[model samples]
Target: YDNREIVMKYIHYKLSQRGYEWDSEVVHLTLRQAGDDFSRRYRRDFAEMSSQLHLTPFTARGRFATVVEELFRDGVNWGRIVAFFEFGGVMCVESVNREMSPLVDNIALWMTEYLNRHLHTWIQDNGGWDAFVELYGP
Candidate 1:
């Protein structure tokens, strides 16, 4: 039974040190923003938080962006990257409570579809797929 509390605690602690708290909704929204919001102003905090958690900025952003970009690439058609990340968040819920509830499952489908289509085009338009792969993957 996986629990996000591990990740959540770390995320919470890191943010707290930066005078940030985990508002599930806002965090969810930020995750929904994908790279943009986090990449913008919160970048320093995000980086600080990452260091506090012993995570490298490159590894942190790489793993996150890869999953996100993948969810939006290929033939997927997710509404947004944050929604896709939220789907993974749902998966981290404990098994005793893990049922593909309407809300959760819907988000998952949204992410998979997002991966199949939307992302690749946008990424290409931004800087082509390889740039992301090169940055996020290796």
Candidate 2:
């Protein structure tokens, strides 16, 4: 249905070589902290939705990707880009509380798949993750 994989793979290769100039710990910290903040900020909404969101691991994954697609549907921009990682981080956090710890692994894998599907061009066009850090880094 799309050349998403084709464009995504090339971008992956470029980043793999170029590097985000960040260590593994940085990504880990970013995900954890982002998840924490997002969950806390929307605590009530999450409480209300938790049960409805309770889902089979495999099926739960598509929902995450769906939101990523939804966020970008309007248009890709810096704000939506940050929300993408934030949502993925939230899912990882929920996987733990839902007693689906292993689901975190699946979630991350599926996240990259979603990235390939929707975000490849935007990142490549906007100067990659390198540009992100310079603009939004700590």
Candidate 3:
């Protein structure tokens, strides 16, 4: 059986080997601050809707890899992936500034790579980068 705590501890151990430590306190605090700012600036709609978009297709599983595979198989929309990336970016930036830990930075970087690896090709089949730019204009 896969345990969340065991998985988390393994993640911590792996990062620790590379001179990094998972700082949950920093991550949570940064996320909270970012959530508040996002809610104020975007009026909660973006954050709330974004969360729904990403989570709507997610399915829990015994293993992390299984859960990730399920999420990828769900065929998430480009806009939803974009929203998640944006949300992650905001929180990561705050975490970076508040916590001078390579672990935080590495996790943030890993998320970008993970999202792209999983969603980029799938989204391309639907609309490509140009379509994404057009759909989610600045």
Candidate 4:
């Protein structure tokens, strides 16, 4: 029970239930795109969320602002932005288990929860998940 494997297996299982064959590259790209969309759509909300996390006021608040700014920085890679907030490495299942700075991990958790709340329908509205698979598959 590698946590990464377990998590991916469940993801695959869920996709299968939706009549999809998992494509990691496509899934990764889509998640990155979704993260970008999430940032753009909820920039203000993210700011509030970050503040509420009350990240160590002495240092974390600055880091929190820096990370938040990174999300909207010019030419910022959405995937990297995701990692900054949550992933800490490649934005993938494996890093989900990797050790990270507590502040980074907390922010990541917040972003992840936000994405989980919105990603499915975001994909659906943008183009069905099936379309994403067909278009972004390796």
Name the best candidate (by lDDT).
Answer: 2
Q: Cα deviation of 69 in candidate 4 (Å)?
A: 7.9
Question: Residues 1-138, candidate 2, lDDT per residue (tens digit)?
Answer: 122332233223222333321113343334334434554787885455445455566788777756667778989876666556655555655666666767765666676776676677887899875565555555
Estimate TM-scores for all models: 0.29, 0.61, 0.42, 0.32
Could you say which candidate leads in TM-score? 2
Mind giving the per-residue lDDT tens digits that candidate 3 earns over 57-87?
1221122233345444756875345334444
Q: Candidate 1 — which residues are off by over 4 angstroms?
A: 1-83, 91-98, 101-106
- How would you encode candidate 4's per-residue C-alpha lDDT over 1-138 as one tens digit per residue? 122332344344433433544445455555445544555676776445433443342554455545545554653333443434332222222222232233333444444543455343454565654565555444
**Predictions ranked by lDDT, top down?**
2, 3, 4, 1
Which candidate order results from sorting by TM-score in descending order? Answer: 2, 3, 4, 1
RMSD, each candidate, Å?
14.8, 9.0, 12.8, 12.2
Write model 1 residue lDDT over 37-133, tens digit each, in one string: 4335555643443233222323433444465665556544323443444324433221112332333333334344544455546645655433433
Give the alpha-carbon lDDT of every model.
0.38, 0.56, 0.43, 0.42
Candidate 2 regions exceeding 4 Å error are 1-52
Give the C-alpha lDDT of model 4: 0.42
